[PDB]
Write a protein that binds this DNA or RNA. Structure first.
Ligand SMILES: [Mg+2]
Ligand SMILES: [Mg+2]
Ligand SMILES: [Mg+2]
Length: 170
RNA sequence: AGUUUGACUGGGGCGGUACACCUGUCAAACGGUAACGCAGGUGUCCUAAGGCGAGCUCAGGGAGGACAGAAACCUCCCGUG
């Protein structure tokens, strides 16, 4: 019934670890991300100096990476094992993307290391349909139109259908 | 002993610099146009903040994401500046 060019898919996954400060803690955090993705992450600096947070401008604060394709689908399932396939209702944004967090990275499938710590991280699945890339192309870029967009209800339907997930009414 | 001891200035002195310059207005839709008219600025700074080329998009806001809160990072959307 539905056009095959409308089926939802995962664009990227966008793991993020926001450590407070720079140094060996951030280097260990980037090591955690590399172990999780098989893929070298990138450090992000602080926009502004905030001394209540102890950060300074242009200081390496966090580490993040984006995963696409089969590897993204694998990492998302690992993260959803920790969450027990239970995403709260408000975890879904109005643009059709959702996300969650985990507190310990060990239960993702990575063995503990005495030197490395107890880092948590953020998962943020960005959903899309085929044809979403026209907003990113260089030549003749465009928007996707109203029907082709993803709503919060459609993203929730996709999660319930694909991962047999449970949406708590929070 | 010789000489000097600025100028403008609603008298002169005191105060200011309207004494060399730049922006908006005055200024009366070309240009020009005065008051110790109004609002301000200048005596610097930059091997890049100069020269090309490439790739990007900014302020702000909305919605989301462990710690993370009104402000830490990540993601999407709107965004004529
Ligand atoms: Mg005239
Ligand atoms: Mg004129
Ligand atoms: Mg260019």
């Amino acid at each position: 019934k539905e056009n095959p060019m409308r089926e939802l898919r995962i664009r990227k996954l966008c793991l993020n670890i926001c450590v407070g400060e720079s140094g060996d803690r951030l280097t260990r955090a980037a090591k955690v991300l590399e172990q999780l993705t098989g893929q070298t992450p990138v450090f992000s600096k602080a926009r502004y100096t905030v001394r209540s947070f102890g950060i300074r401008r242009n200081e390496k604060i966090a580490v993040h990476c984006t995963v696409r394709g089969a590897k993204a689908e694998e990492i998302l399932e690992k993260g959803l094992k920790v969450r027990e396939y239970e995403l709260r209702k408000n975890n879904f944004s109005d643009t059709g993307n959702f996300g969650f967090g985990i507190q310990e990275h060990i239960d993702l499938g990575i063995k503990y290391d005495p030197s490395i710590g107890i880092y948590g991280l953020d998962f943020y699945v960005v959903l899309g349909r085929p044809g979403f890339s026209i907003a990113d192309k260089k030549r003749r870029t465009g928007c996707i139109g109203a029907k082709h967009r993803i709503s919060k209800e459609e993203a929730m339907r996709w999660f319930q259908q694909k991962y047999d997930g449970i949406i708590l009414p929070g």
